[PDB]
Write a protein that binds this ligand. Structure first.
Ligand SMILES: O[C@@H]1[C@@H](O)[C@H](O[C@@H]2CO[C@@H](O[C@@H]3CO[C@@H](O)[C@H](O)[C@H]3O)[C@H](O)[C@H]2O)OC[C@H]1O
Length: 396
């Protein structure tokens, strides 16, 4: 049938997963004859299943979460993403003013944003007190010192989900964004040119952290979001003191604590500044989640994504996922002190870079994430990270 749409998302948390069921049901109630068939896919599996299914758009999801950045661009150029410019509602246009640019390519809108998720450090204030760290580090060297204190106090300072590749790389991305001048950064990302010494500088500053041996001991086999021993699991259960992640974090932790209630002592601080770095200071980096429509899909699919953008649905989103909703007026409903800081940092930001691997596309993103892991496991150098990106870049 044509009033029956297939919907793919990545909410693994029960609350998040529940929210979508509820939106589906209450959408069927305002849309007679229409049934939403849901697939919830674990995030680390999502790209593969999407990129396989959408080889044949006819037999693929009507509505799906976007991979973002260059990865969304790859799907557009494959004709796997419907143009929603003349199709989004006026409520979307108005309330997602800021966020919609993440979904805009060649002046065309390809999706509806549901959240904006900038990155930084999520930490156990308690484990911080127990190690003698009273203030959050404004500098990289200061941070490495706090790792020294935390290691001595007998806790793993930093949880690292290196088994998934990207969580490791996030350290590298942030170092680059603090080392590279905004112009070298922006140009490197667009031109796939990585010759500047700030790319190697960054890895060196990362090697230094590795040498301090302050990661959780199984970081190489630790996933990011799966199970109690995942890196978010370790943070949520106070087995590790901090993690570097996007603002989806509180809702993930909330799903992994012993009682599935928010983490009592969760705190946030921006990525520290780096001495001698040329990065625009306080430069934000993060993500925007949005949903795309199959080009082979019908009006019901369109009405579904517009339904996502409505303020009540977005306010619910914010509470279900413990995140910042895309819709500006829905953000009023955000009560979490950590998210409140992040919104502040967000509100006064000149810009926000998308995740680096997202910005660089599949080949380069993957090669990069993999090489950072290589050097953290002692089988690679800062130079090898650059080499890998350059090599993958030859494909386009
Ligand atoms: O390539 C990297 C990405 O894959 C990464 O994806 C984000 C990671 O985690 C996701 O958080 C989910 C939020 O809601 C819960 O219900 C889920 O269970 C989590 O999986 C997130 O939505 C993705 O956008 O971001 C950064 C890249 O480096």
């Amino acid at each position: 049938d044509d009033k029956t749409i297939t919907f793919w998302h990545n909410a693994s948390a029960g609350e998040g997963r529940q929210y979508w069921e509820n939106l589906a049901k209450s959408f069927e109630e305002a849309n007679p004859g229409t049934k939403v068939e849901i697939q919830a896919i674990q995030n680390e599996d999502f790209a593969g299943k999407l990129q396989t299914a959408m080889q044949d758009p006819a037999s693929g999801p009507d509505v799906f979460m976007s991979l973002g950045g260059a990865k969304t661009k790859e799907m557009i150029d494959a004709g796997q993403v419907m143009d929603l410019t003349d199709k989004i509602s006026d409520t979307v246009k108005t309330d997602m003013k800021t966020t919609l640019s993440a979904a805009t390519f060649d002046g065309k809108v390809y999706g509806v944003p549901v959240s904006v998720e900038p990155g930084g450090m999520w930490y156990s204030k308690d484990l911080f007190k127990k190690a003698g760290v009273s203030d959050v580090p404004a500098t990289y060297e200061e941070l490495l010192a706090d790792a020294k204190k935390l290691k001595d106090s007998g806790t793993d300072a930093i949880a690292l989900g290196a088994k998934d590749a990207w969580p490791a790389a996030h350290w590298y991305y942030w170092l680059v964004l603090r080392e590279c001048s905004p112009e070298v950064y922006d140009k490197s990302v667009q031109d796939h040119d990585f010759s500047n010494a700030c790319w190697v500088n960054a890895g060196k500053k990362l090697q230094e952290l590795k040498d301090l041996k302050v990661f959780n001991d199984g970081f190489l086999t630790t996933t990011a979001q799966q199970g109690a021993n995942s890196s978010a699991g370790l943070l949520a259960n106070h087995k590790a003191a901090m993690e570097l992640m996007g603002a989806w974090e509180p809702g993930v932790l909330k799903d992994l604590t012993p009682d599935q209630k928010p983490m009592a002592d969760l705190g946030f601080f921006a990525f520290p500044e780096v001495a001698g770095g040329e990065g625009e200071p306080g430069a934000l980096m993060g993500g925007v989640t949005y949903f795309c429509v199959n080009p082979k899909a019908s009006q019901t699919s369109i009405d579904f994504v517009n339904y996502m953008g409505e303020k009540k649905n977005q306010e619910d989103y914010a509470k279900a996922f413990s995140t910042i909703p895309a819709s500006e007026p829905a953000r009023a409903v955000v009560t979490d002190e950590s998210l409140k800081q992040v919104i502040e940092y967000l509100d006064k930001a000149p810009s926000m870079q998308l995740w680096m691997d997202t910005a660089l596309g599949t080949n380069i993103g993957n090669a990069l994430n993999a090489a950072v892991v290589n050097m953290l496991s002692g089988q690679g150098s800062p130079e090898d990270i650059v080499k890998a990106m350059q090599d993958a870049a030859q494909k386009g």
